[PDB]
């Protein structure tokens, strides 16, 4: 067989230990999911420094906690805009998830609170910037560099999926690089507890699985498809399916055809053909052997999964870091005042926040 006695025993034991870890992590998650936290700070506890990123949700700002001096990333959501954009459930769910999960590559929620106008999620500041920026600047990542990041996503999805959480918005834009060069996943607005199937059309066109495009009931296998897209984009510098307009991207995604750069290793192409598999009955991560089909693939043969989890692997790339509160790895955004209001807005809708 492919493994002799010592290697087979070691691999079997490792896989059983993962089961044991995940069972404990599920217990801990469900305890926090049922007995959460709330209203753990207020706005005038922080100095607002600079906008790190924006969206239709609102903005994320670097802030400095006055009493302690620690820097954080504060997501500010305007309640009225959240309601107008029909994102009430997503916003409440994001906070509930962030409050309950615990994993080394999932951003930590340090505080949350609300006022008459806004909702506030105060997360760890992740100073290395978006993977997206580094990828576009460097062009592409080497296969070892891509593999280092990919391994962290595999472990993170193994964790989330054990909790019955589907992530649904993997892309380099949503992956931050911390001071040690490791990944932080931050955005959980589209994540959903799904033990079986779900049906919402959501995600980013280049990263959508065919079964989402085709309006099917779908499951956690869409995250493994998106992993394939991410690995491809990290290693090529561009995603596998692109076009001027989303409908053309969707035609390519559902076609069953993907092309690879000549510099892709055969191991990489084989992994990607098995992740970017249109047929659900054949896609890695969705078979009887689950995540082990991915973790045991030849392209990951050099990956020490425990050492990645323990953050003991030397990262291929360390972002520039001039000190606490250094924002140089983020873009510049027009700064806008955060107006509260003497009148409570949307109190009923956000009672649970």
């Amino acid at each position: 067989g492919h493994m002799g006695n010592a290697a087979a025993a070691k691999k079997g034991s490792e896989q059983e230990s993962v089961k044991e870890f995940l069972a404990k992590a599920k217990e801990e998650f469900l305890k926090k999911w049922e007995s959460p936290s709330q209203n753990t700070a207020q706005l005038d506890h922080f100095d607002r420094i600079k906008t790190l990123g924006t969206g239709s949700f609102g903005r994320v700002m670097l802030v400095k906690h006055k009493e302690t001096g620690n820097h954080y990333a504060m997501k500010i959501l305007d309640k009225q805009k959240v309601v107008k954009l029909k994102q009430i459930e997503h916003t409440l769910n994001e906070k509930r998830i962030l409050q309950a999960v615990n994993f080394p590559f999932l951003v930590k929620l340090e505080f949350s609170f609300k006022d008459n106008s806004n909702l506030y999620m105060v997360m760890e500041y992740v100073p290395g910037g978006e993977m997206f920026s580094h990828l576009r600047r460097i062009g592409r990542f080497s296969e070892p560099h891509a593999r280092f990041y990919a391994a962290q996503i595999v472990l993170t999805f193994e964790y989330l999926h054990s909790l019955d959480l589907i992530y649904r918005d993997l892309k380099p834009e949503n992956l931050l690089i911390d001071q040690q060069g490791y990944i932080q996943v931050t955005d959980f607005g589209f994540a959903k507890r799904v033990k079986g199937r779900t049906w919402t059309l959501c995600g980013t066109p280049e990263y959508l699985a065919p079964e989402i495009i085709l309006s099917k009931g779908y499951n956690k296998a869409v995250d493994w498809w998106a992993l394939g897209v991410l690995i491809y984009e990290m290693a090529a510098g561009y995603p596998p399916f692109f076009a001027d307009q989303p409908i053309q991207i969707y035609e390519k995604i559902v076609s069953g055809k993907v092309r690879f750069p000549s510099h892709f290793s055969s191991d990489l192409k084989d992994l990607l053909r098995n992740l970017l598999q249109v047929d659900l009955t054949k896609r890695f991560g969705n078979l009887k052997n689950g995540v082990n089909d991915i973790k045991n693939h030849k392209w990951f043969a050099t990956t020490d999964w425990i050492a990645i989890y323990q953050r003991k692997v030397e990262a291929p790339f360390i972002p520039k870091f001039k000190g606490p509160g250094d924002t140089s790895n983020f873009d510049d955004y027009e700064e806008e005042e955060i107006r509260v209001s003497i009148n409570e807005k949307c109190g009923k809708e956000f009672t649970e926040f």
Partner: peptide, 19 residues
């Protein structure tokens, strides 16, 4: 090249979700 085709797509910047 495929890279040139990517540039031509105009989708080289940060990509929004469907919503």
């Amino acid at each position: 090249t495929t890279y040139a085709d990517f540039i031509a797509s105009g989708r080289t910047g940060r990509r929004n979700a469907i919503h």
